[PDB]
Design a protein around this nucleic acid. Sequence first.
RNA 1: GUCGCCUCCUAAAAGGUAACGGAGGCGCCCAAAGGUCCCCUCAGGCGGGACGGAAAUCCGCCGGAGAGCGCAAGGGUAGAA
RNA 2: CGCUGACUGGGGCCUGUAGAGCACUGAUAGGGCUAGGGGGCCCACCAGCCUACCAAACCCUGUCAAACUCCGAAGGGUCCC
RNA 3: AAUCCCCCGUGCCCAUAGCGGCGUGGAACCACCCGUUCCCAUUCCGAACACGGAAGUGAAACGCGCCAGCGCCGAUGGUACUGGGCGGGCGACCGCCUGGGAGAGUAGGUCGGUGCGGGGGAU
RNA 4: GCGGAUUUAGCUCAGUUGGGAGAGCGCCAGACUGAAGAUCUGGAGGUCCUGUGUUCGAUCCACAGAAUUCGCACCA
RNA 5: GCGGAUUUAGCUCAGUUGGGAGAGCGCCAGACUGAAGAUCUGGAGGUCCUGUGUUCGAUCCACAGAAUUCGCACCA
Lengths: 138, 86, 53, 122, 113
Amino acid sequence: SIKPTRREYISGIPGKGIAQFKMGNNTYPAQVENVVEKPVQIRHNALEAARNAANRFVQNSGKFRIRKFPFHVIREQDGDGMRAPFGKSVGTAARSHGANHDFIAWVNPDPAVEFAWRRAYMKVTPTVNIDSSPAGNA
Amino acid sequence: AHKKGVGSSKNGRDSNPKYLGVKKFGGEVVKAGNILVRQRGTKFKAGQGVGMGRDHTLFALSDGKVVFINKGKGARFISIEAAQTE
Amino acid sequence: AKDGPRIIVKMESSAGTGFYYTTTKNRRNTQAKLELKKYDPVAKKHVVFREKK
Amino acid sequence: FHEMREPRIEKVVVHMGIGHANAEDILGEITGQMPVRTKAKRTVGEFDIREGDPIGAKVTLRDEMAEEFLQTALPLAELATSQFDDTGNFSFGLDVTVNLVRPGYRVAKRDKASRSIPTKHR
Amino acid sequence: PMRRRREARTDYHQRLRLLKSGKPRLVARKSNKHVRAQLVTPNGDDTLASAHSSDLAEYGWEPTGSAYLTGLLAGLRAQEAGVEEAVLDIGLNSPTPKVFAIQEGAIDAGLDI
RNA sequence: GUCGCCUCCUAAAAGGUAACGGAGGCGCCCAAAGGUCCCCUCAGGCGGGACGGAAAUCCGCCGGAGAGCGCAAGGGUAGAA
RNA sequence: CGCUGACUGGGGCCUGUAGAGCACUGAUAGGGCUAGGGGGCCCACCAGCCUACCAAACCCUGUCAAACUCCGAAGGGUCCC
RNA sequence: AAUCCCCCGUGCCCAUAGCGGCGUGGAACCACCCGUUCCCAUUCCGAACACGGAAGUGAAACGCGCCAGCGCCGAUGGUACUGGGCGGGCGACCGCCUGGGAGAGUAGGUCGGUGCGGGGGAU
RNA sequence: GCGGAUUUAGCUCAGUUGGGAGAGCGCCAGACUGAAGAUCUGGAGGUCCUGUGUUCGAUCCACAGAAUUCGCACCA
RNA sequence: GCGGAUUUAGCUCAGUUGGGAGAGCGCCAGACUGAAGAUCUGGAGGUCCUGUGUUCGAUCCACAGAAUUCGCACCA
């Protein structure tokens, strides 16, 4: 699972650069959401993005909440050629542990936001699972 | 005629800590428990540790030896039933 | 040893004659011509002991 | 029990301290329990950067001694108000304070069952 | 902290100091009102009420003497058992003039210290 | 570039293993951090007053010690180093 | 030398990854309480006032760590039977 | 002098004893207490350490009890991880067969349990 | 570290009769200048490297370190 | 992409107990002059590169990163 050099010697202590979590609107019952099943150092950027474009197409009430966030990263070409490879960082994310609670399209009756997220999945990358929560989606 | 930087690259060397004699074997007036040399041995087994309880070493002679804090210096004697009248 | 005119200077100390000496490392750092303590040369035992050398 | 809460002295300091030699000797003569403590810091709000000097003066004085002082020293101070702080206690003047002594004070001294001094007793 | 590192005052460990060895914990527990010591010796040892201010009433000779005797006797009681050389036990405070007192006891008590 | 040596991580849980794999320290020093005997109870936060408005100095409360230990880390650990 | 050996059954004593966990630490998100900077208002030494923008720290809803772990197994070890 | 109730020195089990809220005890016990020439003693005062002693008091430390709010302990059924055996997918990986089986998560549990000696308290 | 060379005012240096602490500046001031500079006047200049000793008296003589400097000594 | 060094009040540059910061040439006010200028008279002034770490406190001590000037990129 190769990971980095340490949380403060190589590259650890950042903001990772992205676009925060919550959007949409509340909602007590209606369980509208999204998660996955795929494993992948979720492509930060790709990530950040994606989700966002999500808001881009909707706007307001639909828990545009989203429970992800990278925090480590790769490295490669920088220096001699191919041999004794030092390290030049770039591209952090987070392991999407073979499925789990993604982001939530949560609200009473507002599928006008379900389709949204939908548009949100379309995007993304690793396939994605379209779903509902305790109760379903109203 | 000097050395460089931006190459962290700094292997590390060797140690060799252990519990030698582990818990409850033929006890011999020799290096008891180890994880801090200069150590200052003790009397019989040890049971004090950043854990709670204690450890017996059904082995008794002169003494053993500590490790500075870890393990837990000896003192709670425990010659062992194998220390009575021949 | 590694003779380093760096506040690092090796010295000994006689036994009022008790005869010979005994090992010691030092540092002008403080108290220069300062250096006394007892021991026991092949000479009986004990004996004042200046260190200077 | 009205024979409890009802007070009975308890400490009472009175000191001073300048980014400095002797001034505390004017301190010794007014009482008898010399304060020798070291203030510090490291800046230039007075030229007190020196972070490890002996300037802090504090002539501790509870009971007995303090009495002679509360006495011969309580007349030249003119106020009696506000300067009354919560924690049953207060500080006026060139540097002086004194603490109340309700019945539930001490306990706060124990290494054990150190009752964080309730706020209904003090 | 561990129970004995957040309270304060004691030194029990300066008791365990002598624990290592030397003999009976001729430990002398004090409480002004009087003095009371036992004899904690190694191995989940025990004691033999060697000397107490009440054992034989609390007299009326205050500190001084009290000790002077409580000890002696104490020392007397024990050396009947079969001890001999017992290690002292400052139990607490500094071998105050009390302390020192009792102390005498032992010593004079013939129970070597 | 780099070779010695001290620590972490890598070692998959005894021990121990490459990598031009990760990060960071050392070729000092301290005559008094030496030996014991005797005493001490940290950081910090809160509340009250001099010179003081970060940041002291004292006084009164709260405290698995998070301070403390010449130096890098890691173990330790106030009972105390 | 001759039943001691790999291995299994039993018995102690250890390691503490994977996992999990948040009180140690360092991230990090939605938010509440708040004071630091605002910000608009009496013109503003006013340091009195309201509040929609950024925050520190405490509180609730949440989440990542090889050089984090109050928690903790798979298993391996070692002496004896 | 070889039984229980109590207090006192005090030990083991390293919070099912801690925090704190109310309360109770002083005949006995213990402290606080009363003073300070001499023992010793505070870098400042006999606050703490300390020598001598009644009255006064249970306020305080303190000891037994009640209170779950903070904490601490913590099952059963349960899911991860996995020693061993064998299958699917090029794929990061998925699954099965057999013994092991935690933390957190609701129940609930806890306001210690127990040694030896001393003073009494039960002819 | 083996040997030689010296030790004085802010800088650079004299100082041999063992008794005065000196010179230059350089530096400060006065005079002069429209001012400053140049010249003339004047003044200061002090841990005589430290300590101890010798001496009626020490910069001076004696005893270690000392520091600066030059040469040299190099198979741990 | 690799190694050295540099990014200080407009400009060229100095500082190794680090603990307290300048030099020459600009810029504004006052004199000299009918007038500018050169030249005598005083002052105003800086993240010692961006963001951090050791440390009582450092920009001068140390670790990354952007911009700067120079070297290296050669053998088939």
